């Protein structure tokens, strides 16, 4: 199992006309596999949607993925911006 | 490392034959020397002065030469043509 493969490639034709949105070298970088989209980085480790307790067929349409991601409440953020100045 | 040795430059004869310095021994900011101006502890800054890269470029390496009740003073003149 090797480590030092290249795994990125560049085509010789300068097509740099409509490409300011992609990832440029500074040309266009062309990798050997796709990307990986990760929804939320921090798992919410309790929350019986995920913990599955052993007590007591049901569906639930939760709002967004933001339930599973430890977001702070806004009153603390306003308190901290008041503590800013 | 990065330290200048303490000796081994004797650029004196080229200033004797510089023809800008008014030395009568031979015939054939806005300051000039940084003896009042700091250089913020880089020696490379002293290479901006035009009489000092003269003594690093045109210098050489020298080897050191090694060695009554009333004084009577006598003046001695010296006048020799040579080449």
């Amino acid at each position: 199992i090797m480590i030092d493969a290249a795994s990125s490639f560049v085509l010789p034709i300068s097509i740099t006309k409509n490409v300011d949105v992609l990832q440029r070298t500074d040309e266009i970088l062309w990798f050997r596999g796709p990307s990986v989209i990760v929804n939320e980085r921090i798992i919410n480790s309790g929350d019986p949607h995920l913990s599955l307790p052993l007590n007591r067929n049901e569906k639930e349409s939760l709002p967004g993925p933001f339930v599973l991601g430890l977001r702070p409440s806004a009153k603390f953020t306003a308190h901290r911006l008041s503590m800013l100045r | 490392n990065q330290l200048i040795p303490q000796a081994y430059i004797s650029n004196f004869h080229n200033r004797l034959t510089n023809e800008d310095d008014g030395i009568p021994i031979f015939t054939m900011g806005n300051a000039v020397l940084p003896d009042l101006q700091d250089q913020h502890h880089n020696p490379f800054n002293i290479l901006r002065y035009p009489k000092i890269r003269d003594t690093f470029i045109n210098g050489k390496v020298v080897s050191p030469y090694r060695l009554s009740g009333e004084a009577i003073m006598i003046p001695i003149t010296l006048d020799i043509e040579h080449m």
């Binding site: 030092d4 290249a6 990125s8 490639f9 560049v10 085509l11 010789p12 034709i13 062309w30 | 490392n1 990065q2 330290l3 200048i4 040795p5 020696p43 490379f44 290479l47 690093f56 470029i57 210098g59």
Partner: peptide
Amino acid sequence: FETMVANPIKVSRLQSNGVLTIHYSLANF
């Protein structure tokens, strides 16, 4: 376009780790 072999970018591991960024240490004329 299907005959357009691409150029590998090699990383050369010792370049990736610790490369810094000689006359500017004044001891060598």
